[PDB]
Amino acid sequence: IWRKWHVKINQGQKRFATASALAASAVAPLLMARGHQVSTVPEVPLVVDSAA
Amino acid sequence: VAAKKHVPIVKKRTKRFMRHQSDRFKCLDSAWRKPKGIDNRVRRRFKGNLAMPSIGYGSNKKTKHMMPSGHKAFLVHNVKDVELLLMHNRTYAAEIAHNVSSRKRIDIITRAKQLGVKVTNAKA
Amino acid sequence: PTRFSKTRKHRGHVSAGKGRVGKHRKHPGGRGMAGGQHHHRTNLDKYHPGYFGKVGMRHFHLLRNHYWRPSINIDKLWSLVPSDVREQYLSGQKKDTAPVIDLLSHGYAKLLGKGRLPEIPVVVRARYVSAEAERKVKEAGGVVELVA
Amino acid sequence: SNVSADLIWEVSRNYNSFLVKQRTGTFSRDALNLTNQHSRKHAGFVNDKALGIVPAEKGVKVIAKKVKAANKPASSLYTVTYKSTARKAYKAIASQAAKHGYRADLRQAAVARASAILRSQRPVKPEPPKKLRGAAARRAA
Amino acid sequence: GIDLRWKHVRSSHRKAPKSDNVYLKLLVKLYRFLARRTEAPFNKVVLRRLFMSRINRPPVSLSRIARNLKNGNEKKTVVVVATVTDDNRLLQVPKMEVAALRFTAKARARIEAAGGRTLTLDQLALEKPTGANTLLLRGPKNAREAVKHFGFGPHKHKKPYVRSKGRKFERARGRRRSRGFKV
RNA sequence: AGAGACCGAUAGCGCACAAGUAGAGUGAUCGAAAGAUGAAAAGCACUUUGAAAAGAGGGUUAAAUAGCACGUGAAAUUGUUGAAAGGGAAGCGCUUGUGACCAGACUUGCGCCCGGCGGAUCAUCCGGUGUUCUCACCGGUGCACUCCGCCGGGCUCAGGCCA
RNA sequence: CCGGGACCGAGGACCGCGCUCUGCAAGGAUGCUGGCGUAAUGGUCACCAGCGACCCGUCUUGAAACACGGACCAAGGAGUCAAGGUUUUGCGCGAGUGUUUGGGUGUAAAACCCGCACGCGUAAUGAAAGUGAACGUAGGUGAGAGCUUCGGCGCAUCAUCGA
RNA sequence: AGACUAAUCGAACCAUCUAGUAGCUGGUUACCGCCGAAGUUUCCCUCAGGAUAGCAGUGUCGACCUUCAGUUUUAUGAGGU
RNA sequence: GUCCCACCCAUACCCCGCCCUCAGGGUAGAAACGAUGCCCUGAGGAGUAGGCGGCCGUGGAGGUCAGUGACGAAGCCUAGG
Ligand SMILES: [Mg+2]
Ligand SMILES: [Mg+2]
Ligand SMILES: [Mg+2]
Ligand SMILES: [Mg+2]
Ligand SMILES: [Mg+2]
Ligand SMILES: [Mg+2]
Ligand SMILES: [Mg+2]
Ligand SMILES: [Mg+2]
Ligand SMILES: [Mg+2]
Ligand SMILES: [Mg+2]
Ligand SMILES: [Mg+2]
Ligand SMILES: [Mg+2]
Ligand SMILES: [Mg+2]
Ligand SMILES: [Mg+2]
Ligand SMILES: [Mg+2]
Ligand SMILES: [Mg+2]
Ligand SMILES: [Mg+2]
Ligand SMILES: [Mg+2]
Ligand SMILES: [Mg+2]
Ligand SMILES: [Mg+2]
Ligand SMILES: [Mg+2]
Ligand SMILES: [Mg+2]
Ligand SMILES: [Mg+2]
Ligand SMILES: [Mg+2]
Ligand SMILES: [Mg+2]
Ligand SMILES: [Mg+2]
Ligand SMILES: [Mg+2]
Ligand SMILES: [Mg+2]
Ligand SMILES: [Mg+2]
Ligand SMILES: [Mg+2]
Ligand SMILES: [Mg+2]
Ligand SMILES: [Mg+2]
Ligand SMILES: [Mg+2]
Ligand SMILES: [Mg+2]
Ligand SMILES: [Mg+2]
Ligand SMILES: [Mg+2]
Ligand SMILES: [Mg+2]
Ligand SMILES: [Mg+2]
Ligand SMILES: [Mg+2]
Ligand SMILES: [Mg+2]
Ligand SMILES: [Mg+2]
Ligand SMILES: [Mg+2]
Ligand SMILES: [Mg+2]
Ligand SMILES: [Mg+2]
Ligand SMILES: [Mg+2]
Ligand SMILES: [Mg+2]
Ligand SMILES: [Mg+2]
Ligand SMILES: [Mg+2]
Ligand SMILES: [Mg+2]
Ligand SMILES: [Mg+2]
Ligand SMILES: [Mg+2]
Ligand SMILES: [Mg+2]
Ligand SMILES: [Mg+2]
Ligand SMILES: [Mg+2]
Ligand SMILES: [Mg+2]
Ligand SMILES: [Mg+2]
Ligand SMILES: [Mg+2]
């Protein structure tokens, strides 16, 4: 039971990766290339006027 | 339809490179295995014994992977997959997977007849 | 990750890369530091020259707090003051005011002197100070006074 | 900026959802991909200018990409339906792809796909019945 | 028989980066085209130096740049395919323009504070495709802790592997004639 | 009490079952093997042969190629039917021959001309819409020598195998 | 300078070198013709025939050995994990670097945030008391990629003489 | 008589330490491609075993300096078969 | 015993086809490319102990094929491809 289960990674690289994911979330071709169905969305940064 | 003109196909070998001593024991399969014995006659290439597979038996790039008709096999599973061969009807041929139902088999055959794609296993 | 390791490339090959005549037995040669003076002497004198012997006097109940005195050189002395004021001093707009740096508050006790110092007077409060550092601080217009 | 067609090709170069890779070759099931091959030249979804051809109920349907509305996918497609004549559709597609420098290298594939679609909409002739060679003696009884 | 000493001998230098950075792949494509279709040896040298590993691309400092910015080189372009690090010892930084693979935050701040400009390898290729009026620089390759342990032996004065330092660790026999001999 | 990038009946605790049981030793102690018919027994009424056990009919079920030796039923080994070889071993490699069986390709396509037939408008033009802002589409106009399919005749070209 | 015979046909618009120069034997085969369009060509399996061919694994200078293990089949069956080192490859920051002992928060063994100390590095040398890194644009000489106003400036590194 | 002490005696049987240690026998599981050895030097209560040097592979960097050679020629020394 | 003609055959030598390895070149005012691609040219291929690279299968986990299936999934047999 004392094998190494969890791992430790730098917070700087964690923050780098989550920022890379946010940057890659604004590219529509990647959205289609990942299998999403976004053929009928007006703007790829979808924003709602606080109706919820 | 017929395929494009190509150079003649040469196989360089037809036999299957059976495993040494697999014709005398039933516990050994016929799949080839490299012998690691210190004094094996096949590993030592004695005259009059089984041959060994080498990289020198490879085929020409032009006729590699193509069946004697001239096409290349392509495994299909439904009617949406066979539509990928729209632009390749003189180079590729379709082959329906073994677990496809009879209804989808006749749907694939019907669509392929209009698209002109040859089907290797259709008489069923 | 076991999918990439050399033990899988040894499958089908007898002796698993350890040799036929020499068969990788359990513990040939002994365990640990055995044979230091008898059969591992060539390794222990070509490498690690100085393993055996006694040198120096012994100390009973050593407390390392008695021997705590981190040091800082003089070429990093200006790095203690903040950047905004440091650029003002280096640019030369005061001409009438001098800073007093307290090494203890930053965690240092002795001021060594290795590099050069610009011609601006300063005052340093240190537990210890070197002779060359004192000379350089005097030739820079400053003065150092012990604070304990 | 930090993003371009070359970068998107680099990111989706090794694996993507539209890829169908197996033995004897690799293909791509992309709407904006002609010849259904996996290559930078024919990858419609990464390039700024691309073409696509889809069969309609009677004729051809041609879709193109509008570079001005890349961030607006709902209105970034130029669609047109050709159902008049084969030669007229051939000329319209060729001019649409080789008159204003909008991917002039895809003219041959764009016209060819339309030709294949029109060839595939005619009625099919009935295949002649198969003969027998070694089972003829068995079936004689 | 053919009587050769070597056959099927491989090359000794890298022919492709081991890193999988996409931007580095783009930069390699750019400089592979420039080096193929340009007469300047500067392009071939930068292309090869882009292949190097991290231990073969040591950092250079602002002080080291100021060292080579004398004797009539104040107007040239410094090219360093490595990281650039600020030096705390240098109090006044001269005015210069630097093109480097990447900069530290404080080094960039002090360069733009002094009145300089920080470039990028793509801007360098855009302004000086042939590398005119430039000087290349490297960091200290042998200034590494691991190099002090290399080639240990008698009468070589290298550094040994010890778990600690003190009067009980090594010294003794073989380091002084008071206990046997010396090395 | 709640969970798993754990094992899945030679595995996982010795024990998924009347398991610390059956069993061995005077005794301290040692210590197993063994899960699965079908949704529901609806677990074969009755006739006949036979000393009996059993068999053949005939029945239930989607199935008895699921019958309480019961899901799927491989190899070692054995029986019958079919084919073949054998003068102190057999097996194997290269290359023909004889006998048994068999996968492909082929069955035309393209273009042109002449005639017949059904057509429905081709170029052009103007109005609107989109666009890569110069090309497209749609609304109407055409008028037999345009365009578009069908048939019959002819012509050329190329297309299987062995020489 | 004239005969006879054998094996082969790689490449796929033009570009080049030449000649006997409306053309050619000059950077790789084309032309005419016959039979058959199926078991004909071809492929698999079984048998006879010509030549070849000692039983595997292992120790050993030497194994087909009168050296050892092996009657046959099915399932199981052997370089793994932890702590501490070392070199190399990839990544982040950089004279600094490391959030997770702990606290806040949470869609709750996940994710996110927070701070004093502390670890390694920034200064060594002696047994110890102790002391502690610039004469020079941080030195001189011989080689050095590259740049250059063409005179020269000279990274990394090697050797050598000094501080 | 080293005899007998539950088919066990020149030191009974049962469980645990215990997966006791072994310089000694036996075994060690898919394919292809490229390179490719040693039984020799020194030390060890060492001679069926190790460390050390040698042979080998992989990862490289600086030249491409033009650099070198199990070789011949010319000039000039040593040797005691 | 000596001399002289013709003739037979190795995985050896010469020419041609194909495979792999290594080495040297060409490819963007992109009518462009699994740029890890394509095209041109030359040489080489034996191997235990051992070293490195590329690939084929088995049990599970994340993402994706809007994947196959009681009109038959998995498994098993098969001198049928
Ligand atoms: Mg084969
Ligand atoms: Mg041998
Ligand atoms: Mg081996
Ligand atoms: Mg062994
Ligand atoms: Mg050993
Ligand atoms: Mg003494
Ligand atoms: Mg059990
Ligand atoms: Mg069982
Ligand atoms: Mg059990
Ligand atoms: Mg059962
Ligand atoms: Mg009955
Ligand atoms: Mg009865
Ligand atoms: Mg059934
Ligand atoms: Mg059943
Ligand atoms: Mg039974
Ligand atoms: Mg059964
Ligand atoms: Mg059987
Ligand atoms: Mg026989
Ligand atoms: Mg025999
Ligand atoms: Mg007519
Ligand atoms: Mg009409
Ligand atoms: Mg009209
Ligand atoms: Mg109209
Ligand atoms: Mg009319
Ligand atoms: Mg011929
Ligand atoms: Mg003919
Ligand atoms: Mg035949
Ligand atoms: Mg013989
Ligand atoms: Mg012997
Ligand atoms: Mg043997
Ligand atoms: Mg004998
Ligand atoms: Mg023995
Ligand atoms: Mg025996
Ligand atoms: Mg098994
Ligand atoms: Mg470790
Ligand atoms: Mg700290
Ligand atoms: Mg030079
Ligand atoms: Mg000078
Ligand atoms: Mg006696
Ligand atoms: Mg007794
Ligand atoms: Mg005794
Ligand atoms: Mg006992
Ligand atoms: Mg053990
Ligand atoms: Mg070799
Ligand atoms: Mg001794
Ligand atoms: Mg020895
Ligand atoms: Mg032995
Ligand atoms: Mg003599
Ligand atoms: Mg003598
Ligand atoms: Mg003598
Ligand atoms: Mg190349
Ligand atoms: Mg050879
Ligand atoms: Mg080899
Ligand atoms: Mg798997
Ligand atoms: Mg498992
Ligand atoms: Mg379904
Ligand atoms: Mg099935």
- Alpha-carbon span C46 to E151, nearest angstrom: 12
Residue B18 token pair = 């059976």
Q: Which nucleotide is closest to the Cα of D102 by its C1'?
A: F132
Q: Shortest CA distance to C45 belongs to which of E180, E181, E183?
A: E183
**Ligand 36 center to C83 CA (angstroms):** 20
Give the CA D24 to C1' G44 distance in Å: 26
**Ligand 54 center to A20 CA (angstroms):** 30
DSSP run (H or E) holding B109: helix B102-115
**Ligand 23 center to D80 CA (angstroms):** 15
Backbone angles phi, psi at D36, to 5 degrees: 55, 40
- Protein chain B, residues 61-80, with a C-beta closer than 7 Å to any atom of nucleic acid strand I: 61, 77-78, 80
Q: Which nucleotide is closest to the Cα of B57 by its C1'?
A: I19
- Alpha-carbon span E44 to E50, nearest angstrom: 10
CB contact under 8 A, B114 and D124: yes
CB contact under 8 A, D116 and B88: no
Contact in structure between C102 and C122 (CB atoms under 8 Å): no
Give chain C as a 3 state SS string. CCCCCCCCCCCCCHHHHCCCCCCCCCCCCCCCCCCCCCCCHHHHHHCCCCCCCCCCCCCCCCCHHHHCCCEECCCCHHHHCCHHHHHHHHHCCCCCCCCEEEHHHHCCCEECCCCCCCCCCCEEEECEECHHHHHHHHHCCCEEEECC
Q: Does the annotation list B29 as a binding residue?
A: no
Contact in structure between D7 and D15 (CB atoms under 8 Å): no
Give the CA E29 to C1' G72 distance in Å: 65
- Alpha-carbon span C73 to C80, nearest angstrom: 12
DSSP run (H or E) holding E77: strand E77-85
Q: Which nucleotide is closest to the Cα of C6 by its C1'?
A: G79
Contact in structure between E122 and E141 (CB atoms under 8 Å): no
Question: ∠ CA(D95), CA(D101), CA(D106), 5° rounding?
Answer: 70
- Alpha-carbon span C26 to C133, nearest angstrom: 62
Among E88, E91, E179, whose Cβ lies nearest the Cβ of C90?
E91
The sign of the torsion formed by the CA atoms of D79, D81, D85, D86 equals positive
- Alpha-carbon span C50 to C44, nearest angstrom: 9
Q: Residue D62: which residues within 8 A CB-CB, separation 6 or more?
A: D51, D52, D53, D79, D80, D81, D82, D93, D96
CA-based R_g, chain B, Å: 21
Tell me the resolution in Å. Answer: 3.2
Q: Which residue has the tokens 């040994």?
A: E160
CB contact under 8 A, C55 and E176: yes
C56 contact E CB<8A: yes
Residue C16 token pair = 């698993």
Contact in structure between C123 and C100 (CB atoms under 8 Å): yes
- Measured to protein CB atoms, the chain F nucleotides within 7 Å are 75-77, 90-94, 101-109, 123, 130-138, 147-148, 150, 159
The sign of the torsion formed by the CA atoms of E125, E128, E130, E132 equals negative
- Alpha-carbon span E103 to E83, nearest angstrom: 6
- Which residue's alpha carbon is at the shortest distance from the C1' of I35? E29
CB contact under 8 A, D71 and A43: yes
Give the CA C104 to C1' H3 distance in Å: 93
Contact in structure between B48 and B61 (CB atoms under 8 Å): no
The pairing of beta strand E60-61 with beta strand D77-82: unpaired
CB contact under 8 A, A33 and D17: yes
Contact in structure between C86 and C127 (CB atoms under 8 Å): no
| Selected residues 23-42 of chain B with any CB under 8 Å from a CB in chain C | 33-34, 36
Residue E170 token pair = 């090594």
Method: cryo-EM
- Alpha-carbon span E57 to E51, nearest angstrom: 10
DSSP run (H or E) holding E126: helix E121-127
Give the CA B76 to C1' F72 distance in Å: 30
Q: How far is CA D130 from the centre of its chain?
A: 34
